[PDB]
Amino acid sequence: KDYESLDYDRCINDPYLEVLETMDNKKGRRYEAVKWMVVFAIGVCTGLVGLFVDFFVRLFTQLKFGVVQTSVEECSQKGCLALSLLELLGFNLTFVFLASLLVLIEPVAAGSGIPEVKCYLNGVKVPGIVRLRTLLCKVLGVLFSVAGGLFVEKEGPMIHSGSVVGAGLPQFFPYFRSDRDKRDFVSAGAAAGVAAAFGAPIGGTLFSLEEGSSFWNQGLTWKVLFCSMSATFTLNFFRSGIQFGSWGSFQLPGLLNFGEFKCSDSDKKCHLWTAMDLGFFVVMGVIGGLLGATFNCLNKRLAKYRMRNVHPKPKLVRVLESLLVSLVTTVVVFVASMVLGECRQMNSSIKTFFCPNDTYNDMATLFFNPQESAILQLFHQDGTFSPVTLALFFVLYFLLACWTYGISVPSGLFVPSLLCGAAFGRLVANVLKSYIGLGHIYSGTFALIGAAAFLGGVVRMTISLTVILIESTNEITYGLPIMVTLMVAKWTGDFFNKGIYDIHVGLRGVPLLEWETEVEMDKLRASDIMEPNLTYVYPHTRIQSLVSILRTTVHHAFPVVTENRGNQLISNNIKFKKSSILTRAGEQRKRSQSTMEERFRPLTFHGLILRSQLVTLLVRGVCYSESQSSASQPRLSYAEMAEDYPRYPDIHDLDLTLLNPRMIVDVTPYMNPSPFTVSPNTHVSQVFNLFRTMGLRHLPVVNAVGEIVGIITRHNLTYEFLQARLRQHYQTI
Amino acid sequence: KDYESLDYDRCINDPYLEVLETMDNKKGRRYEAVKWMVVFAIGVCTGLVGLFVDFFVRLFTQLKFGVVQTSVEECSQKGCLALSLLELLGFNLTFVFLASLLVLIEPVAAGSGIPEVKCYLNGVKVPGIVRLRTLLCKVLGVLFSVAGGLFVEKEGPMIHSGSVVGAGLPQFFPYFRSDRDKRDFVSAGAAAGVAAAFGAPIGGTLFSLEEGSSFWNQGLTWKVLFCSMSATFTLNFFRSGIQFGSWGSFQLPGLLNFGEFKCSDSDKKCHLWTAMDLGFFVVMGVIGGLLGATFNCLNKRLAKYRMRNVHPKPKLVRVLESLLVSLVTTVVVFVASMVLGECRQMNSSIKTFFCPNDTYNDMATLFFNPQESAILQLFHQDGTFSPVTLALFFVLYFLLACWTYGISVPSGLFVPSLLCGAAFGRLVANVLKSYIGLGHIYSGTFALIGAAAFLGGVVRMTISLTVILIESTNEITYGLPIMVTLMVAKWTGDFFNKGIYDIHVGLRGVPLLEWETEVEMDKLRASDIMEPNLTYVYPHTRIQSLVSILRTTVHHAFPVVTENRGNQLISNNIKFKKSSILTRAGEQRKRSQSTMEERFRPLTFHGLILRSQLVTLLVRGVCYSESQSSASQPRLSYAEMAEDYPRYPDIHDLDLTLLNPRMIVDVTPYMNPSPFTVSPNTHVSQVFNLFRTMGLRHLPVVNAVGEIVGIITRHNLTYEFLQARLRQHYQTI
Ligand SMILES: Nc1ncnc2c1ncn2[C@@H]1O[C@H](COP(=O)(O)OP(=O)(O)OP(=O)(O)O)[C@@H](O)[C@H]1O
Ligand SMILES: Nc1ncnc2c1ncn2[C@@H]1O[C@H](COP(=O)(O)OP(=O)(O)OP(=O)(O)O)[C@@H](O)[C@H]1O
Ligand SMILES: [Cl-]
Ligand SMILES: [Cl-]
Ligand SMILES: [Cl-]
Ligand SMILES: [Cl-]
Ligand SMILES: [Mg+2]
Ligand SMILES: [Mg+2]
């Protein structure tokens, strides 16, 4: 596949300089105030999207579980026990069918949105991730998927749903059109989505700080923190005013909350955790890492099977697959609820199914409750679940969650991984207490650590995940046990495979820049990875050359260079080359006054010109005849160049009949005169640091005599390319 | 004053390349494991330093208040009430005298350490901030200053005390000698100090992320977070095992904890805060900003008075000043305790002085308790303090804290600013309740917001302060009220002046690089700020030229250049210039094979050589005679060059008699061949961004023909220089 990076790096040219001269400090303050308003609006809209999802998910789940429960009672008294299953199947197969049609409409909405937000914040531009139809096909697709009982989550796709809003809202005010601002706003939207999904605004801010790992922008972080705070306190304001009666109160954080981690007042010896518990937490982490590695291995194999045996099929398939998994999931839940469910002697939350009077089914209250409610029941209830029920539930949920992720419907992954771990932690707590007396500590701490050591095993996130979990638990004393079970569960799994998001990004072939380069690649140099063969643009070039290079080549940036070694064209190029060069003595006096040889030729580097800018110049009548001076020019302003920003014209789309060939066009005023440059002797570590942190695109390599010697893009710094070049370097020596 | 920046930027030269070739992946993993161990040790040692301070501060305070309290009782029954004052004066004047002698020993330990940590993390190297004697003169100076009742704090100097440990411990293992690692370790130590002082490891991590605003280091942040977690959970483990009996439990976080913010179970209408409270919080923020601005104005005037009327005096003064302020702040406390104190009918915390039976003195229990205890009493305890007592206490504490900061003793500023705000918040809560009924909300929320809106007024920190306060309160629902009163209390104060740390850094004249440049300076270019006159080093230069440039000039880096336009020296320079250049066709074929004018001259840029490297080469016999080939050379290895890292020899210290002049020395193998470079057309925004984030030093400016036209350092990007050059630019046009 072919992917195109973002134009994050600022291009300062003559129209931008005119706008700069016009602007003053008061206009800057007004623009910054408008930016604050837009950030607040993005946060509020993400909170509202989360509210819309949450309200209707439960409005449908309650209806579906209130139509079957009476059917369960009557068909159980009659002994038929078949009408309820049929009604549940009808509900699930209708909801999943509606959720899969909405993904046939927009295929990018499939799965968790996080793999497509790790890429946009990296600057890769997955072709359809920030348009409104994707938001409609994901928000409406989730509430028909999780309401159909597919063992999926809602807080996963919330990051993508917030990212879409952050991309859309700032665009209406031409000052917000550039990608330099769009990437900042999508980072703010992702932070807001994380905050609204987990109730951890600091966690969302740190999630946005990496995955977009650029220079520390103090002021952008202070805005993406306010966006997350506004997102998590707008969802809270409405969700604590609809469920309860009090409106002004803020009684419950975002969609996934853990609860209150306090021990009973009766036991003074009881503590949340003690120094002895840390040894148990280290083993829980290394077991969770192995379980997450098994999960990732199985899901990677399943995805490899699907990408070759299901995707290359008519659109009728990828709907039958989702219906099949929904039918299997419903039948397994219902059968494991009537049978293998332990009726225990005894609330609105608790569910009584297939059990006698004054008795409840632990498996039924596990499965028929919403996943967020089941997490609370596994955190803060003791003695409700027997160890056999917990083991069977863990096995079934683990297998079905592994088999479900990858199908067309907009699935999530945080909750189904945060809920198997809760079962594992509760099970190990139950077996520990019976085996040897450990009643001096809270029992829900083991469930929390089991959930954390499974998230760390599956998604393998750090910093962001640690802060998200700590802020979700609302207990700072869990700072150390969580972190030391997130850095072990990762270190255990890294031996086997990468995180699931990395797995599902690598299957598509998306070119990503890793967190940092290795030392062996630091042994490599910039000359080895660069591209010597160049497609260049002369200043004062002709229209024929421009259309030829635009049609022939797919590159999006061309260096503007002059030969180091038509008559009007040559004269203008020589004049520009002479005028541009600024000698040291000239600067001091200004201050005081106050074949293959032909193909590869010495070319003095002058700037970079984008394909978009060249096409914009071609569409307009920006050209001067050789007879007249180069001073004559339509001289497009900055607004005129930015009018057509979101979608630029394709060169094949232009008629090209009106354009007179052999007419000179001046690209000097519109090029980027001084982009970042690296010497051929710079090592790959410095090049990678510049490319990643500056967010730049098309880094040129220029030698010590000012001659451009190569070009470098994202495809040159990708991991497999560096591995191949390092292997070739070892082979040469 | 003259300050020298850090050598943060990596220098990759031939000895480094040899070490790189020797090293493999297993050695890299072992080195990373050792780095993890060193980070853990830094965290543990910072926690132990905090424990040492905390234990002895209370051990001295309890003795000092147990010697007077009895004496107060008997001298009050007799009516003398004079012996207790003499005992208190003796204790205070002895402790302050001992605290001021330890600062006469090490003058840098004076005041809060934060202004000296904002500079080192900026890369300015205040001359004595990371040596062991400073740690001894600050840790031991604090426990004799706060124990003497000077209205100072302990949590301020803890950041500097952790920074010193982080600077000292990694140096014993030559791999940790470079400043590239020292700055990382001092950032980790500062994060650990913040965590141990406030119990907010995430707050310390974010405090270290800025003030060192560089490229996003994923892996370094994950280490400075673990360092802070280890620091705050080692202090906790000992402080909850010494005060209590249980050792394994973690019952109390670092030195300054707020408590538990829960409302009484009796009132259901009661909440921590509600939506209508936000209007009151906004006004509390704008009042706290004005109070902080008044504090800053008064303290700046006092400091400007002291720096010209007290500092240029014999060392006998600056001790009499501290004794005078201690004598005043003892008499004021004692008099405001017997008089102006309301004896109210009624615990170990509560303090009774100058009151009849079954009564307590509210002012006396405010003053005679430790500041951390007074904060708790002002937060979670209602009805104890009358509004008159609170107003008088706020006025007295505000004035004496403003007058105390700046004297020689190691004062702090967080607690004395976090404690006036608590009094203001409690006062406004008491006034509001009597004025109109607002019993539907918690009363300690107003105290918390008043403290936050005074910290925001005084120190004017963001992001870091917000997270520190949120994690200290142990309540995530306080995220929004706190943030919206830190962004207002700052926005109100910015109209008047800057924070205490900015003021007290600017008074010394330390060159700092701001968070970002303004748009008006973005109008400016790199040619305007650069330095055209250059002191350069030829490759294969003679000893005489090197000693001349080293003695004549104070610059610490010299460009290695060759003239663009002895016979052996000229021949070697020409050969090097010819061999170094790599043309584009050469790269392709290698892949396929597999007066004023004399002073300012065209010079092709080849690299940068540090003064330290030149002095190291001069000290050894690194030189070859013109008769013999340049290939002959002692060829110092990496370890030999790094043997003398912390303190480099001064050129005047060398005898220079042994060194034979007119012997050629080749500096090519040891220079930095490919540093970061900027074109003269680059604007000041990009130049500042590169300089600040890459942490680099001596950025060279090279034109389009490879000729170096200028040099840029920290002094060129400082705010005053940019303002002057922008004013000149406006004058020219
Ligand atoms: N103007 C250019 N002239 C020659 N080679 C180029 C040019 N631009 C990029 N390359 C090289 O071509 C290869 C990939 O080119 P590609 O068509 O993917 O670039 P692009 O579409 O402009 O970039 P991106 O995918 O990052 O948006 C890389 O090796 C890159 O260094
Ligand atoms: N090698 C050099 N040749 C000429 N000018 C220089 C050189 N190095 C620095 N300068 C300029 O001299 C001025 C200040 O020089 P200074 O003596 O403070 O530098 P330094 O001590 O090497 O740097 P630093 O203070 O950042 O450690 C600045 O304008 C800077 O651009
Ligand atoms: Cl989720
Ligand atoms: Cl997910
Ligand atoms: Cl402090
Ligand atoms: Cl301080
Ligand atoms: Mg492309
Ligand atoms: Mg200097």
Side-chain angles (χ1 to χ4, degrees), chain A residues 112 114 156 412-414 501:
Chain A
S112 180
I114 299 171
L413 203 67
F414 262 80
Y501 300 134

Side-chain angles (χ1 to χ4, degrees), chain B residues 147-152 154-172 174-212:
Chain B
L150 281 173
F151 295 168
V152 306
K154 307 183 296 295
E155 290 80 0
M158 202 74 37
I159 303 171
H160 190 276
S161 297
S163 173
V164 172
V165 162
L169 270 194
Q171 331 292 314
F172 286 110
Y175 36 87
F176 285 149
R177 303 281 200 270
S178 66
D179 277 359
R180 178 56 168 254
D181 295 88
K182 182 131 54 182
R183 183 170 174 268
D184 306 351
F185 281 121
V186 298
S187 64
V194 176
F198 296 98
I202 303 167
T205 302
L206 281 168
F207 173 76
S208 291
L209 279 187
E210 67 261 13
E211 315 299 333

Side-chain angles (χ1 to χ4, degrees), chain B residues 182 419 540 639 654 719:
Chain B
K182 182 131 54 182
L419 192 141
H540 309 266
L654 282 72
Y719 184 79

Side-chain angles (χ1 to χ4, degrees), chain B residues 103 106-113 116 126-129 131 134 138 160 508:
Chain B
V103 180
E106 200 75 14
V108 66
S112 180
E116 280 79 72
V126 183
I129 45 177
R131 55 180 58 190
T134 305
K138 181 173 275 290
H160 190 276
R508 294 181 182 178

Side-chain angles (χ1 to χ4, degrees), chain A residues 527 530 584 591 597 601, chain B residues 527 530 584 591 601:
Chain A
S527 297
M530 77 167 169
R584 169 161 151 256
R591 288 199 183 186
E597 291 305 302
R601 206 191 312 111
Chain B
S527 297
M530 82 195 192
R584 171 160 151 257
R591 289 199 181 187
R601 206 191 312 111

Side-chain angles (χ1 to χ4, degrees), chain B residues 549-564 566-570:
Chain B
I549 65 180
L550 283 179
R551 293 201 279 85
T552 303
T553 61
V554 65
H555 313 120
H556 282 89
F558 309 100
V560 179
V561 299
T562 60
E563 261 166 30
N564 197 2
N567 191 23
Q568 202 59 3
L569 187 152
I570 296 169

Side-chain angles (χ1 to χ4, degrees), chain B residues 536 538 561-564 573 577 598 601-604:
Chain B
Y536 39 84
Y538 297 119
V561 299
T562 60
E563 261 166 30
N564 197 2
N573 292 25
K577 185 181 202 283
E598 186 64 30
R601 206 191 312 111
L603 301 152
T604 298

